[PDB]
Design a protein around this ligand. Structure first.
Ligand SMILES: [Zn+2]
Lengths: 21, 30
């Protein structure tokens, strides 16, 4: 989920956008 | 865009900024 990808690890702008509606 | 670990409230603010009018879902136990 988002925590694992973007907080534990680092996310690109594109990966963060996967959590938009 | 920043290349850093984004956690807690900072992560939520990043989604509010990136997603704009679309909105977003924050589901931490996923
Ligand atoms: Zn802080």
């Amino acid at each position: 989920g988002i925590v694992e990808q973007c907080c534990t690890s680092i996310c690109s702008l594109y990966q963060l956008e996967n959590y938009c509606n | 865009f920043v290349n850093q670990h984004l956690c807690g409230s900072h992560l939520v603010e990043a989604l509010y900024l990136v997603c704009g009018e679309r909105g977003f879902f924050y589901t931490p136990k996923t």
